[PDB]
């Protein structure tokens, strides 16, 4: 996995959970230890947190460590959304770790929604990768960079996907909050579905990173730097390309099913 030659996360000071975030649901399944967060899911409830701010723009990261063993049907997430502002008609930019059975790898799923998931059609913009490390064995850095021109997803400072702006209809242009959660995705598990005999399924988040612009920030605020000079460098592009070439397992654009008239950016 070659150096991208620029390490955005190393330029932003970490914050403790409570400086940027608050429990949103499952408060009983959440704990904070010196700024580090543990959340978990069992048959009674999952858990999730939200930013104290809405944002117009920024870089949003966390160190995240995933549950070991049988995790089929469980999703650990870190994402931006305004579903609470525009319920059912919302924008979202996701990092989702799809749980698995022991013996097989976690899949990192990236996704983008703009003005609603489908009501008659499943309308995803998914790009899934396998990882070149074991995400359960340590904390690794995951980030979402979102501006009015582009979304970039980073894993350990390696860009894995860039979703550029091609039309207003296909790009997120409204403010968003940040969220994370652990939850039951057995409806997609059509490996398998959630088996609660392996119960708490725990998600661990630490060293939160914010290089961002609240909705109300002074107009001079711009998102943090993610490259030398303000577009991805060719070295970063090359790292991304290697990732997609060696670890990408699904790209909605390449999927010959799926109605591309409903996602015209491909």
């Amino acid at each position: 996995p070659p150096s991208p030659g620029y390490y955005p996360s190393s330029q932003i000071t970490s914050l403790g959970f409570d400086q940027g975030y608050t429990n949103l649901w499952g408060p009983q399944h959440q704990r904070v230890d010196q700024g580090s967060l543990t959340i978990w899911l069992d048959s009674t409830s999952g858990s999730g947190f939200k930013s104290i701010n809405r944002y117009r723009s920024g870089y949003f990261g966390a160190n995240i460590k995933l549950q070991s063993g049988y995790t089929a049907g469980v999703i650990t997430s870190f994402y931006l959304s305004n579903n609470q502002d525009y319920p059912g008609k919302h924008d979202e930019i996701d990092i989702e770790f799809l749980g698995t059975i022991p013996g097989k790898p976690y899949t990192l799923q990236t996704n983008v929604f703009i003005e609603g998931s489908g009501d008659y059609n499943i309308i995803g913009r998914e790009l899934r990768i396998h990882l070149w490390f074991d995400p359960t064995q340590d904390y690794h850095n995951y980030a979402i960079y979102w501006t009015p021109s582009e979304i970039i997803f980073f894993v350990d400072d390696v860009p894995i996907r860039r979703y550029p702006r091609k039309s207003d209809a296909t790009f997120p242009l409204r403010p968003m909050w940040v969220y994370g959660s652990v939850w039951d995705a057995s409806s997609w598990a059509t490996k398998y579905k959630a088996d609660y005999r392996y119960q708490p399924f725990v998600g661990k988040y630490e060293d939160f990173k914010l290089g961002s612009c609240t909705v109300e920030a002074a107009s001079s605020c711009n998102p943090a730097s993610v490259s030398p000079y303000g577009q991805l460098s060719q070295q970063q592009v090359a790292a991304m390309e290697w990732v997609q070439k060696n670890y990408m397992v699904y790209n909605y654009c390449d999927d010959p099913t799926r109605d591309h008239t409903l996602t015209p950016e491909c």
Side-chain angles (χ1 to χ4, degrees):
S3 187
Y6 189 86
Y7 294 85
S9 69
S10 69
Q11 288 144 202
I12 299 160
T13 304
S14 294
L15 63 138
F17 183 74
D18 295 323
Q19 298 159 255
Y21 300 91
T22 191
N23 179 79
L24 182 65
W25 73 91
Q28 79 290 353
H29 279 21
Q30 183 185 281
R31 63 176 294 112
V32 180
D33 297 279
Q34 298 92 32
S36 305
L37 203 232
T38 306
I39 64 171
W40 66 97
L41 163 84
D42 65 23
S43 36
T44 278
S45 175
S47 195
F49 63 92
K50 184 186 176 179
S51 68
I52 91 215
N53 287 291
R54 286 198 302 159
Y55 294 92
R56 68 175 182 242
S57 222
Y59 172 98
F60 308 92
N63 279 206
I64 305 169
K65 183 158 98 126
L66 304 177
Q67 171 73 54
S68 303
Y70 191 114
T71 53
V74 6
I75 293 194
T76 312
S77 87
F78 184 72
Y79 67 102
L80 313 178
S81 186
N82 55 29
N83 186 243
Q84 295 183 106
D85 302 322
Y86 301 112
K89 320 191 216 225
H90 64 108
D91 328 303
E92 193 158 297
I93 306 169
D94 304 296
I95 296 168
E96 296 175 315
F97 305 91
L98 316 187
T100 212
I101 291 180
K104 79 224 68 151
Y106 268 92
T107 293
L108 192 161
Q109 180 171 272
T110 63
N111 206 358
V112 187
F113 290 97
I114 311 91
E115 302 170 71
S117 17
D119 288 339
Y120 304 88
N121 293 313
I122 312 94
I123 307 172
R125 292 169 162 99
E126 307 98 327
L127 187 160
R128 281 162 185 211
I129 62 153
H130 289 332
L131 303 161
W132 52 91
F133 52 87
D134 185 345
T136 70
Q137 292 303 113
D138 198 354
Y139 292 91
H140 288 261
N141 201 78
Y142 297 98
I144 298 164
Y145 177 71
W146 164 61
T147 76
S149 54
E150 69 196 332
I151 296 157
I152 306 162
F153 302 85
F154 294 90
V155 178
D156 287 335
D157 282 323
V158 182
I160 69 157
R161 176 182 193 181
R162 177 173 184 252
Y163 183 88
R165 175 175 176 189
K166 300 202 187 192
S167 61
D168 294 10
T170 61
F171 197 81
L173 291 171
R174 289 185 299 178
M176 279 145 155
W177 312 74
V178 194
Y179 301 87
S181 61
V182 189
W183 60 280
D184 186 341
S186 294
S187 266
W188 298 250
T190 58
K191 55 208 105 116
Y192 269 118
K193 24 187 304 206
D195 194 332
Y196 287 92
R197 312 203 253 74
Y198 292 96
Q199 215 142 39
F201 308 94
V202 175
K204 284 175 162 269
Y205 302 66
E206 189 162 80
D207 301 328
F208 295 91
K209 272 163 178 161
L210 297 166
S212 313
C213 310
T214 73
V215 166
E216 295 299 335
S219 84
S220 81
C221 183
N222 300 317
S225 199
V226 117
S227 59
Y229 313 108
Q231 64 249 344
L232 288 181
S233 76
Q234 294 300 298
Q235 194 173 347
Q236 291 175 115
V237 162
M240 181 159 83
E241 278 173 7
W242 184 96
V243 165
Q244 294 188 13
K245 158 164 184 148
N246 288 298
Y247 287 95
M248 176 173 81
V249 294
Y250 183 75
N251 183 20
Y252 77 108
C253 290
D254 301 324
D255 177 359
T257 67
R258 244 97 190 283
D259 182 38
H260 289 101
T261 83
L262 301 218
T263 64
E265 74 278 359
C266 304

PDB file of all heavy atoms in Angstrom, residues 230-258:
ATOM      1  N   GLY A 230      -4.289  21.546  -2.495  1.00  0.00           N
ATOM      2  CA  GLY A 230      -5.716  21.839  -2.827  1.00  0.00           C
ATOM      3  C   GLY A 230      -6.439  21.179  -4.013  1.00  0.00           C
ATOM      4  O   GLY A 230      -7.618  21.517  -4.379  1.00  0.00           O
ATOM      5  N   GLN A 231      -5.750  20.227  -4.613  1.00  0.00           N
ATOM      6  CA  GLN A 231      -6.389  19.086  -5.188  1.00  0.00           C
ATOM      7  C   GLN A 231      -5.508  17.870  -4.817  1.00  0.00           C
ATOM      8  O   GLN A 231      -4.312  18.017  -4.512  1.00  0.00           O
ATOM      9  CB  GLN A 231      -6.517  19.259  -6.711  1.00  0.00           C
ATOM     10  CG  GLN A 231      -5.188  19.342  -7.537  1.00  0.00           C
ATOM     11  CD  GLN A 231      -4.858  20.730  -8.171  1.00  0.00           C
ATOM     12  OE1 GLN A 231      -5.716  21.628  -8.291  1.00  0.00           O
ATOM     13  NE2 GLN A 231      -3.601  20.867  -8.628  1.00  0.00           N
ATOM     14  N   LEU A 232      -6.067  16.664  -4.901  1.00  0.00           N
ATOM     15  CA  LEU A 232      -5.257  15.489  -4.640  1.00  0.00           C
ATOM     16  C   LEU A 232      -4.045  15.474  -5.528  1.00  0.00           C
ATOM     17  O   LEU A 232      -4.137  15.672  -6.740  1.00  0.00           O
ATOM     18  CB  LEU A 232      -6.009  14.208  -4.828  1.00  0.00           C
ATOM     19  CG  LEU A 232      -7.060  13.765  -3.854  1.00  0.00           C
ATOM     20  CD1 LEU A 232      -7.588  12.407  -4.381  1.00  0.00           C
ATOM     21  CD2 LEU A 232      -6.561  13.619  -2.428  1.00  0.00           C
ATOM     22  N   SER A 233      -2.907  15.232  -4.894  1.00  0.00           N
ATOM     23  CA  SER A 233      -1.623  15.087  -5.568  1.00  0.00           C
ATOM     24  C   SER A 233      -1.614  13.801  -6.367  1.00  0.00           C
ATOM     25  O   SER A 233      -2.391  12.878  -6.135  1.00  0.00           O
ATOM     26  CB  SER A 233      -0.472  15.093  -4.582  1.00  0.00           C
ATOM     27  OG  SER A 233      -0.372  13.852  -3.879  1.00  0.00           O
ATOM     28  N   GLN A 234      -0.714  13.728  -7.318  1.00  0.00           N
ATOM     29  CA  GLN A 234      -0.614  12.536  -8.115  1.00  0.00           C
ATOM     30  C   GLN A 234      -0.161  11.327  -7.301  1.00  0.00           C
ATOM     31  O   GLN A 234      -0.511  10.200  -7.605  1.00  0.00           O
ATOM     32  CB  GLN A 234       0.298  12.823  -9.316  1.00  0.00           C
ATOM     33  CG  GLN A 234      -0.369  13.877 -10.288  1.00  0.00           C
ATOM     34  CD  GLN A 234      -1.711  13.399 -10.855  1.00  0.00           C
ATOM     35  OE1 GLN A 234      -1.730  12.388 -11.550  1.00  0.00           O
ATOM     36  NE2 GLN A 234      -2.819  14.139 -10.591  1.00  0.00           N
ATOM     37  N   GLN A 235       0.620  11.569  -6.258  1.00  0.00           N
ATOM     38  CA  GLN A 235       0.977  10.518  -5.356  1.00  0.00           C
ATOM     39  C   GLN A 235      -0.240  10.000  -4.546  1.00  0.00           C
ATOM     40  O   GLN A 235      -0.415   8.803  -4.373  1.00  0.00           O
ATOM     41  CB  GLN A 235       2.098  10.961  -4.433  1.00  0.00           C
ATOM     42  CG  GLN A 235       2.742   9.780  -3.698  1.00  0.00           C
ATOM     43  CD  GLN A 235       3.980  10.191  -2.910  1.00  0.00           C
ATOM     44  OE1 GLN A 235       4.523  11.306  -3.093  1.00  0.00           O
ATOM     45  NE2 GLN A 235       4.415   9.303  -1.995  1.00  0.00           N
ATOM     46  N   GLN A 236      -1.072  10.883  -4.070  1.00  0.00           N
ATOM     47  CA  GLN A 236      -2.346  10.478  -3.472  1.00  0.00           C
ATOM     48  C   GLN A 236      -3.275   9.754  -4.466  1.00  0.00           C
ATOM     49  O   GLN A 236      -3.830   8.724  -4.154  1.00  0.00           O
ATOM     50  CB  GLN A 236      -3.088  11.683  -2.911  1.00  0.00           C
ATOM     51  CG  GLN A 236      -2.449  12.305  -1.709  1.00  0.00           C
ATOM     52  CD  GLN A 236      -3.136  13.566  -1.257  1.00  0.00           C
ATOM     53  OE1 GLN A 236      -3.700  13.615  -0.152  1.00  0.00           O
ATOM     54  NE2 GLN A 236      -3.056  14.606  -2.058  1.00  0.00           N
ATOM     55  N   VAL A 237      -3.438  10.301  -5.665  1.00  0.00           N
ATOM     56  CA  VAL A 237      -4.172   9.606  -6.726  1.00  0.00           C
ATOM     57  C   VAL A 237      -3.649   8.167  -6.978  1.00  0.00           C
ATOM     58  O   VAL A 237      -4.411   7.206  -6.942  1.00  0.00           O
ATOM     59  CB  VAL A 237      -4.228  10.452  -7.978  1.00  0.00           C
ATOM     60  CG1 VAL A 237      -4.593   9.608  -9.225  1.00  0.00           C
ATOM     61  CG2 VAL A 237      -5.272  11.571  -7.787  1.00  0.00           C
ATOM     62  N   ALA A 238      -2.349   8.016  -7.129  1.00  0.00           N
ATOM     63  CA  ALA A 238      -1.750   6.709  -7.260  1.00  0.00           C
ATOM     64  C   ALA A 238      -2.028   5.752  -6.104  1.00  0.00           C
ATOM     65  O   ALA A 238      -2.259   4.595  -6.303  1.00  0.00           O
ATOM     66  CB  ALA A 238      -0.241   6.853  -7.503  1.00  0.00           C
ATOM     67  N   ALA A 239      -2.029   6.232  -4.884  1.00  0.00           N
ATOM     68  CA  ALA A 239      -2.365   5.392  -3.771  1.00  0.00           C
ATOM     69  C   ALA A 239      -3.821   4.914  -3.847  1.00  0.00           C
ATOM     70  O   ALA A 239      -4.123   3.734  -3.607  1.00  0.00           O
ATOM     71  CB  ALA A 239      -2.082   6.134  -2.455  1.00  0.00           C
ATOM     72  N   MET A 240      -4.721   5.842  -4.133  1.00  0.00           N
ATOM     73  CA  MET A 240      -6.123   5.522  -4.345  1.00  0.00           C
ATOM     74  C   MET A 240      -6.325   4.480  -5.424  1.00  0.00           C
ATOM     75  O   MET A 240      -7.143   3.551  -5.257  1.00  0.00           O
ATOM     76  CB  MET A 240      -6.891   6.777  -4.750  1.00  0.00           C
ATOM     77  CG  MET A 240      -8.397   6.536  -4.981  1.00  0.00           C
ATOM     78  SD  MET A 240      -9.267   8.101  -4.832  1.00  0.00           S
ATOM     79  CE  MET A 240      -9.043   8.763  -6.456  1.00  0.00           C
ATOM     80  N   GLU A 241      -5.594   4.657  -6.535  1.00  0.00           N
ATOM     81  CA  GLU A 241      -5.708   3.763  -7.667  1.00  0.00           C
ATOM     82  C   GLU A 241      -5.279   2.338  -7.306  1.00  0.00           C
ATOM     83  O   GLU A 241      -5.896   1.389  -7.740  1.00  0.00           O
ATOM     84  CB  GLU A 241      -4.910   4.294  -8.873  1.00  0.00           C
ATOM     85  CG  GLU A 241      -5.709   5.348  -9.659  1.00  0.00           C
ATOM     86  CD  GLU A 241      -4.949   6.074 -10.808  1.00  0.00           C
ATOM     87  OE1 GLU A 241      -3.773   5.713 -11.156  1.00  0.00           O
ATOM     88  OE2 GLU A 241      -5.572   7.033 -11.371  1.00  0.00           O
ATOM     89  N   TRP A 242      -4.170   2.219  -6.589  1.00  0.00           N
ATOM     90  CA  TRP A 242      -3.695   0.962  -6.095  1.00  0.00           C
ATOM     91  C   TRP A 242      -4.746   0.327  -5.165  1.00  0.00           C
ATOM     92  O   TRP A 242      -4.965  -0.868  -5.184  1.00  0.00           O
ATOM     93  CB  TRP A 242      -2.395   1.213  -5.338  1.00  0.00           C
ATOM     94  CG  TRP A 242      -1.699  -0.047  -4.822  1.00  0.00           C
ATOM     95  CD1 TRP A 242      -0.701  -0.725  -5.441  1.00  0.00           C
ATOM     96  CD2 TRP A 242      -1.987  -0.774  -3.613  1.00  0.00           C
ATOM     97  NE1 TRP A 242      -0.326  -1.814  -4.686  1.00  0.00           N
ATOM     98  CE2 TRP A 242      -1.094  -1.867  -3.561  1.00  0.00           C
ATOM     99  CE3 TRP A 242      -2.898  -0.596  -2.564  1.00  0.00           C
ATOM    100  CZ2 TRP A 242      -1.093  -2.798  -2.512  1.00  0.00           C
ATOM    101  CZ3 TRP A 242      -2.898  -1.518  -1.513  1.00  0.00           C
ATOM    102  CH2 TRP A 242      -1.997  -2.606  -1.494  1.00  0.00           C
ATOM    103  N   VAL A 243      -5.378   1.129  -4.322  1.00  0.00           N
ATOM    104  CA  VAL A 243      -6.393   0.594  -3.407  1.00  0.00           C
ATOM    105  C   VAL A 243      -7.544   0.001  -4.225  1.00  0.00           C
ATOM    106  O   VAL A 243      -7.933  -1.161  -4.010  1.00  0.00           O
ATOM    107  CB  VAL A 243      -6.892   1.667  -2.424  1.00  0.00           C
ATOM    108  CG1 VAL A 243      -8.192   1.231  -1.720  1.00  0.00           C
ATOM    109  CG2 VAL A 243      -5.799   1.931  -1.400  1.00  0.00           C
ATOM    110  N   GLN A 244      -8.047   0.781  -5.184  1.00  0.00           N
ATOM    111  CA  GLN A 244      -9.197   0.350  -5.957  1.00  0.00           C
ATOM    112  C   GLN A 244      -8.850  -0.857  -6.804  1.00  0.00           C
ATOM    113  O   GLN A 244      -9.677  -1.775  -6.992  1.00  0.00           O
ATOM    114  CB  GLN A 244      -9.787   1.512  -6.758  1.00  0.00           C
ATOM    115  CG  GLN A 244     -10.366   2.557  -5.829  1.00  0.00           C
ATOM    116  CD  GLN A 244     -11.121   3.633  -6.514  1.00  0.00           C
ATOM    117  OE1 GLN A 244     -11.424   3.510  -7.671  1.00  0.00           O
ATOM    118  NE2 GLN A 244     -11.485   4.681  -5.795  1.00  0.00           N
ATOM    119  N   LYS A 245      -7.602  -0.900  -7.280  1.00  0.00           N
ATOM    120  CA  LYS A 245      -7.183  -1.945  -8.152  1.00  0.00           C
ATOM    121  C   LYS A 245      -7.019  -3.264  -7.408  1.00  0.00           C
ATOM    122  O   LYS A 245      -7.309  -4.295  -7.925  1.00  0.00           O
ATOM    123  CB  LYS A 245      -5.881  -1.551  -8.856  1.00  0.00           C
ATOM    124  CG  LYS A 245      -5.156  -2.763  -9.335  1.00  0.00           C
ATOM    125  CD  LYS A 245      -4.096  -2.506 -10.337  1.00  0.00           C
ATOM    126  CE  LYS A 245      -3.494  -3.867 -10.805  1.00  0.00           C
ATOM    127  NZ  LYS A 245      -3.079  -3.696 -12.241  1.00  0.00           N
ATOM    128  N   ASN A 246      -6.560  -3.205  -6.178  1.00  0.00           N
ATOM    129  CA  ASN A 246      -6.251  -4.398  -5.377  1.00  0.00           C
ATOM    130  C   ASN A 246      -7.285  -4.841  -4.334  1.00  0.00           C
ATOM    131  O   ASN A 246      -7.305  -6.015  -3.976  1.00  0.00           O
ATOM    132  CB  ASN A 246      -4.888  -4.193  -4.684  1.00  0.00           C
ATOM    133  CG  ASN A 246      -3.746  -4.285  -5.671  1.00  0.00           C
ATOM    134  OD1 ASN A 246      -3.564  -5.317  -6.277  1.00  0.00           O
ATOM    135  ND2 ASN A 246      -3.012  -3.191  -5.876  1.00  0.00           N
ATOM    136  N   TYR A 247      -8.125  -3.916  -3.858  1.00  0.00           N
ATOM    137  CA  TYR A 247      -9.065  -4.186  -2.762  1.00  0.00           C
ATOM    138  C   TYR A 247     -10.533  -3.881  -2.999  1.00  0.00           C
ATOM    139  O   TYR A 247     -11.387  -4.242  -2.174  1.00  0.00           O
ATOM    140  CB  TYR A 247      -8.576  -3.428  -1.535  1.00  0.00           C
ATOM    141  CG  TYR A 247      -7.351  -4.100  -0.980  1.00  0.00           C
ATOM    142  CD1 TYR A 247      -6.066  -3.687  -1.314  1.00  0.00           C
ATOM    143  CD2 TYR A 247      -7.488  -5.192  -0.153  1.00  0.00           C
ATOM    144  CE1 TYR A 247      -4.940  -4.357  -0.816  1.00  0.00           C
ATOM    145  CE2 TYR A 247      -6.407  -5.832   0.384  1.00  0.00           C
ATOM    146  CZ  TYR A 247      -5.129  -5.425   0.051  1.00  0.00           C
ATOM    147  OH  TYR A 247      -4.104  -6.146   0.614  1.00  0.00           O
ATOM    148  N   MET A 248     -10.854  -3.208  -4.103  1.00  0.00           N
ATOM    149  CA  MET A 248     -12.263  -2.882  -4.381  1.00  0.00           C
ATOM    150  C   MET A 248     -13.069  -4.119  -4.797  1.00  0.00           C
ATOM    151  O   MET A 248     -12.688  -4.868  -5.673  1.00  0.00           O
ATOM    152  CB  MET A 248     -12.419  -1.739  -5.348  1.00  0.00           C
ATOM    153  CG  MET A 248     -13.836  -1.421  -5.732  1.00  0.00           C
ATOM    154  SD  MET A 248     -13.855   0.103  -6.741  1.00  0.00           S
ATOM    155  CE  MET A 248     -13.404  -0.610  -8.340  1.00  0.00           C
ATOM    156  N   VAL A 249     -14.173  -4.335  -4.081  1.00  0.00           N
ATOM    157  CA  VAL A 249     -15.012  -5.513  -4.312  1.00  0.00           C
ATOM    158  C   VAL A 249     -16.426  -5.238  -4.856  1.00  0.00           C
ATOM    159  O   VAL A 249     -17.085  -6.146  -5.388  1.00  0.00           O
ATOM    160  CB  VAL A 249     -15.001  -6.423  -3.102  1.00  0.00           C
ATOM    161  CG1 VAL A 249     -13.564  -6.975  -2.975  1.00  0.00           C
ATOM    162  CG2 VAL A 249     -15.460  -5.742  -1.810  1.00  0.00           C
ATOM    163  N   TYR A 250     -16.807  -3.960  -4.850  1.00  0.00           N
ATOM    164  CA  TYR A 250     -18.027  -3.518  -5.438  1.00  0.00           C
ATOM    165  C   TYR A 250     -17.922  -2.049  -5.811  1.00  0.00           C
ATOM    166  O   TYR A 250     -17.490  -1.231  -5.029  1.00  0.00           O
ATOM    167  CB  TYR A 250     -19.221  -3.757  -4.509  1.00  0.00           C
ATOM    168  CG  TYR A 250     -20.521  -3.361  -5.165  1.00  0.00           C
ATOM    169  CD1 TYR A 250     -21.110  -4.167  -6.152  1.00  0.00           C
ATOM    170  CD2 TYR A 250     -21.116  -2.164  -4.865  1.00  0.00           C
ATOM    171  CE1 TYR A 250     -22.289  -3.765  -6.790  1.00  0.00           C
ATOM    172  CE2 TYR A 250     -22.281  -1.770  -5.457  1.00  0.00           C
ATOM    173  CZ  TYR A 250     -22.880  -2.565  -6.417  1.00  0.00           C
ATOM    174  OH  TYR A 250     -24.067  -2.127  -7.001  1.00  0.00           O
ATOM    175  N   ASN A 251     -18.346  -1.736  -7.024  1.00  0.00           N
ATOM    176  CA  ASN A 251     -18.491  -0.373  -7.454  1.00  0.00           C
ATOM    177  C   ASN A 251     -19.848  -0.210  -8.167  1.00  0.00           C
ATOM    178  O   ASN A 251     -20.075  -0.819  -9.189  1.00  0.00           O
ATOM    179  CB  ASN A 251     -17.306  -0.007  -8.355  1.00  0.00           C
ATOM    180  CG  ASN A 251     -17.336   1.463  -8.814  1.00  0.00           C
ATOM    181  OD1 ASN A 251     -17.986   2.311  -8.206  1.00  0.00           O
ATOM    182  ND2 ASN A 251     -16.663   1.737  -9.915  1.00  0.00           N
ATOM    183  N   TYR A 252     -20.785   0.536  -7.586  1.00  0.00           N
ATOM    184  CA  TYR A 252     -22.141   0.643  -8.178  1.00  0.00           C
ATOM    185  C   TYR A 252     -22.152   1.046  -9.688  1.00  0.00           C
ATOM    186  O   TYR A 252     -23.008   0.584 -10.470  1.00  0.00           O
ATOM    187  CB  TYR A 252     -23.015   1.588  -7.355  1.00  0.00           C
ATOM    188  CG  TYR A 252     -22.713   3.077  -7.580  1.00  0.00           C
ATOM    189  CD1 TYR A 252     -23.602   3.893  -8.298  1.00  0.00           C
ATOM    190  CD2 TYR A 252     -21.543   3.657  -7.093  1.00  0.00           C
ATOM    191  CE1 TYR A 252     -23.329   5.247  -8.505  1.00  0.00           C
ATOM    192  CE2 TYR A 252     -21.293   4.994  -7.271  1.00  0.00           C
ATOM    193  CZ  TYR A 252     -22.175   5.785  -7.990  1.00  0.00           C
ATOM    194  OH  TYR A 252     -21.900   7.135  -8.170  1.00  0.00           O
ATOM    195  N   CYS A 253     -21.183   1.860 -10.089  1.00  0.00           N
ATOM    196  CA  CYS A 253     -21.017   2.229 -11.491  1.00  0.00           C
ATOM    197  C   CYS A 253     -20.770   1.053 -12.385  1.00  0.00           C
ATOM    198  O   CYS A 253     -21.188   1.106 -13.521  1.00  0.00           O
ATOM    199  CB  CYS A 253     -19.834   3.189 -11.698  1.00  0.00           C
ATOM    200  SG  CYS A 253     -20.193   4.800 -11.022  1.00  0.00           S
ATOM    201  N   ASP A 254     -20.040   0.035 -11.897  1.00  0.00           N
ATOM    202  CA  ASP A 254     -19.677  -1.158 -12.703  1.00  0.00           C
ATOM    203  C   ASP A 254     -20.750  -2.215 -12.675  1.00  0.00           C
ATOM    204  O   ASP A 254     -20.612  -3.203 -13.346  1.00  0.00           O
ATOM    205  CB  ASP A 254     -18.368  -1.797 -12.192  1.00  0.00           C
ATOM    206  CG  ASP A 254     -17.203  -0.842 -12.225  1.00  0.00           C
ATOM    207  OD1 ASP A 254     -17.167  -0.040 -13.186  1.00  0.00           O
ATOM    208  OD2 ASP A 254     -16.337  -0.875 -11.295  1.00  0.00           O
ATOM    209  N   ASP A 255     -21.778  -2.033 -11.853  1.00  0.00           N
ATOM    210  CA  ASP A 255     -22.767  -3.032 -11.649  1.00  0.00           C
ATOM    211  C   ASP A 255     -23.698  -2.916 -12.834  1.00  0.00           C
ATOM    212  O   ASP A 255     -24.380  -1.913 -12.926  1.00  0.00           O
ATOM    213  CB  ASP A 255     -23.499  -2.792 -10.344  1.00  0.00           C
ATOM    214  CG  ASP A 255     -24.628  -3.792 -10.086  1.00  0.00           C
ATOM    215  OD1 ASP A 255     -24.886  -4.688 -10.905  1.00  0.00           O
ATOM    216  OD2 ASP A 255     -25.279  -3.676  -9.026  1.00  0.00           O
ATOM    217  N   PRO A 256     -23.732  -3.944 -13.739  1.00  0.00           N
ATOM    218  CA  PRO A 256     -24.611  -3.914 -14.910  1.00  0.00           C
ATOM    219  C   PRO A 256     -26.120  -3.971 -14.624  1.00  0.00           C
ATOM    220  O   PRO A 256     -26.901  -3.616 -15.490  1.00  0.00           O
ATOM    221  CB  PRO A 256     -24.167  -5.122 -15.742  1.00  0.00           C
ATOM    222  CG  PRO A 256     -23.142  -5.825 -14.988  1.00  0.00           C
ATOM    223  CD  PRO A 256     -22.944  -5.194 -13.675  1.00  0.00           C
ATOM    224  N   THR A 257     -26.527  -4.401 -13.445  1.00  0.00           N
ATOM    225  CA  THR A 257     -27.885  -4.162 -13.008  1.00  0.00           C
ATOM    226  C   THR A 257     -27.854  -2.754 -12.431  1.00  0.00           C
ATOM    227  O   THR A 257     -26.847  -2.013 -12.586  1.00  0.00           O
ATOM    228  CB  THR A 257     -28.301  -5.179 -11.940  1.00  0.00           C
ATOM    229  OG1 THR A 257     -27.537  -4.976 -10.753  1.00  0.00           O
ATOM    230  CG2 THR A 257     -28.064  -6.611 -12.420  1.00  0.00           C
ATOM    231  N   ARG A 258     -28.889  -2.351 -11.694  1.00  0.00           N
ATOM    232  CA  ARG A 258     -28.935  -0.940 -11.192  1.00  0.00           C
ATOM    233  C   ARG A 258     -29.165   0.045 -12.352  1.00  0.00           C
ATOM    234  O   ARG A 258     -28.515   0.001 -13.437  1.00  0.00           O
ATOM    235  CB  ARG A 258     -27.687  -0.510 -10.366  1.00  0.00           C
ATOM    236  CG  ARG A 258     -27.986  -0.167  -8.904  1.00  0.00           C
ATOM    237  CD  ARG A 258     -27.706  -1.364  -8.020  1.00  0.00           C
ATOM    238  NE  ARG A 258     -28.175  -1.231  -6.628  1.00  0.00           N
ATOM    239  CZ  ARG A 258     -27.578  -0.509  -5.677  1.00  0.00           C
ATOM    240  NH1 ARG A 258     -26.476   0.218  -5.931  1.00  0.00           N
ATOM    241  NH2 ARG A 258     -28.112  -0.495  -4.457  1.00  0.00           N
TER     242      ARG A 258
END
